[PDB]
Point group: D2
Chain length 268, copies 4
């Protein structure tokens, strides 16, 4: 009955139940998908969080900066899904940028070591995961990553904006590689969502009026979006990622779908 009936899908990036990846996983499961999950660092917490999903799925450790984790990933996925089976979908929902690279911290004062780490995790890892997983993906498959529209500069997002610009470019080359396997590669550019990264990384770097200034972001985004925007609701974004993982967008690759309430199409 489900949009993703029978499909085996790897989903990275769950840390809490407000994670975009959590809702992607939840919707994908409501739609009949069989999941393999990956988690970073706080595996015990992640285990407890994933207990809240509609169906239990194996959790595999993946630090995208750890070459050993990347080299063993496909083997460990095959152990979880069974020999002779392959993935139909992969979700990259991963990002990091040091505090120096965000908020009210002067753009010029972020050392390259920090920026590099951020670009490693948030951009290059999209290609790493594709490298690791394409060899175990079925024709008609779909790789999806999460974006935040970086076409224009803005307060606060700072070097993460630069990392997203890189990610968009990486996705276009991932499409070229993926196409050899009959696999699509796309990004979903989401509007703002109240996640752990929002409050701890972005909010943490904004200093004092962070609470009110995020409320400004919500109000302004919902005003610009012709159909409105709810920062408390990741479901519209999760649904969009599932549309891309499905058979219903079979001719879209190297591309970006905007799940932002149409805010990026309006100036005011």
């Amino acid at each position: 009955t489900g949009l993703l009936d029978g499909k085996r899908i790897l989903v990275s990036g769950i840390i809490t139940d407000s994670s975009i990846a959590f809702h992607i996983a939840r919707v994908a499961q409501e739609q009949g998908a069989q999941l393999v999950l990956t988690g970073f660092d706080r595996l015990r917490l992640i285990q407890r969080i994933t207990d809240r999903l509609p169906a239990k799925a194996p959790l595999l450790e993946l630090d995208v900066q750890n070459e050993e984790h990347l080299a063993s990933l496909a083997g460990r996925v095959t152990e979880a899904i069974g020999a002779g089976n392959k993935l139909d979908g992969v979700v990259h929902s991963i990002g990091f940028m040091p505090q120096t690279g965000m908020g009210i911290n002067p753009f010029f004062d972020a050392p390259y070591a920090d920026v590099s780490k951020g670009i490693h995790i948030s951009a290059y890892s999209y290609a790493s995961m594709a490298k690791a997983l394409l060899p175990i993906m079925n024709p008609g498959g779909s790789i999806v990553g999460m974006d935040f529209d970086p076409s224009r500069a803005m307060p606060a997002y700072n070097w993460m904006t630069v990392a997203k610009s890189a990610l968009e470019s990486v996705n276009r080359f991932v499409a070229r590689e993926a196409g050899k396997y009959g696999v699509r590669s796309n990004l979903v550019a989401a509007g703002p969502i109240r996640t752990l990264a929002m409050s701890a990384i972005v909010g943490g770097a904004l200093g004092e009026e962070a609470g009110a200034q995020i409320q400004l972001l919500e109000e302004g985004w919902d005003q610009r979006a012709p159909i409105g925007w709810n920062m408390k609701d990741a479901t519209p974004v999760a649904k969009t990622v599932c549309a891309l993982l499905s058979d219903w967008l079979p001719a879209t690759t190297g591309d970006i779908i905007y799940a932002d309430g149409g805010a990026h199409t309006q100036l005011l």
Copy 2:
């Protein structure tokens, strides 16, 4: 379990069983939608074409330049679907440009009367169909128009390129109106498909260069698309339109979804 089960959808633009609109109607019916079709000019002929669809659907006359057809449209649709019921979707799959505006005919020699006619039918009509139909659309509903990426100039498409550019802009303003109703408005920028218009209009205006240009279009597009492109197969485009008509892209509006094999994301 159909993607569009229960949905009432108006589909304009069928003229042959190669029409992008025809495959849109076919796929939508396969997925449980209940359709109303609109046709232009030769309605007796169109009815024999629509007879080839999987299921019966009422066929309505609509010339988008005819003010009376537009003023009566919502009432005629309401009769077709039953008083009390509203539309969940609307598909604009219509375009025209006079020969002077196309092909090897010099760009400078198209009189404005001819360009204006093409822009009326191909761009302005997206707004006039939205005006007529929004008052009989449900929240969560979806308006979708057909686009051919006009961001760059090219041989042969000439003034139709300009009409498409206008249409993309018209779509962003329709989104502002549609949102007041909880309705989304998007275009699908399709790759090249073997349809009547490509033959009679584009081919016709290319004269002796039609063959070489159409061949280059078939193979060049496939070459550039990372997942490839079958110009003889409208299904991938029709599926993309159904995705937009569905509940699975609920946060996208005023936007363009590219069902072109990824070709627009690659230079070579």
Copy 3:
């Protein structure tokens, strides 16, 4: 030694001494250009206004909707500039939209007759003027038109936004034709300037909240521009046009240069 020393340049669009074209003309003559001016409708007024320029230039009548004017234009310019001389530059600084297509007047209520007149004058005439003048332009020549970034929808600009979208597309096709003559074609997307068109057309259609709403546009453009924006100063825009008329951007064609304080590059 002036930027445009010895260049023969046609400049359209002067109506008042606040007109963008007036400032283009002044800066161009300050830089050694020999001008021919074209005016519409109010020829006695334009003659008077142009008496304020650094040098007296011949003024020719041109209503871009008048086929006879267009058909006789090259002949009339050749008279103004001398037989055996050709133009080095052409400036299109022309636009119109009926009130129904602007301001607080509902988008859906603008009749196509109104929209078509707006598009004729604002977009199609860029090609009309190129058709007329390219046969009397020197290699290395430059055609420049005035744009307002229409990539996103916005309040008030309405159907003019659609006309500018069309204009951008027209410019790319003009470039194809102009290249056959060794001539470049480009647009300058300017930020908001206090001109007759701004007060009469835009402010006129904004109703009672107009003078203040226009002030709020200034405030927001200036805030978004990393280098600020002064709506009272056309000179930075005129300078940019002069740069495109000069020999200093010889590799730029089919393109758009933004003289907008950089506001389009920033989200907030």
Copy 4:
């Protein structure tokens, strides 16, 4: 008389007399500018090369990955130009990418260490040069970097495409900081030019595919550019950079000017 008469301009990125920076330097001196040059590593040979410019100019060592070099840069330039004098122009004409990041080497096989070096040099350094030099730049001044349009993926350019996508994003935030000083920041996206990096980095990484790949690049570019394109001629690009360094584009910042024959505005 000269376009840049009286201006003091720093030009980085000279490595051979085919360097785009060499032609920028030459044209700038021809136009009355006083230069300070920076070079990397091979300073003995760079000095030999700059002795062939029309005018004498101080040459300073700058490795952009060297923190000590950047920390001391403003003081060294001040020594070169005289205390109390400031720079009106800065040209960043610097890029690097390891071979593994380029050509026919598999996109997925580039280790992050290699990509990170390329991004540091090719993108981050645009920000570090701005950080170092803005304190000694005059209001009305101009920072210009060199781009190659990375909006679409393509053969061979591989991870350098990613670095350019990052660089474009960096330029937009540099614009925010530069505007506090009354300074503009922009990129010139150049068409392809035969330089040391083309030969050694791009051509070297293509191997047996270099001939065919570069022929198609060159043929396609000249075909698409409405005014044509000559890969052997850096002067149009050098002129465009000088236009940006001048007073003639005073309202453009955070932006990208294309010196590419108009190629990017045309599909074919």
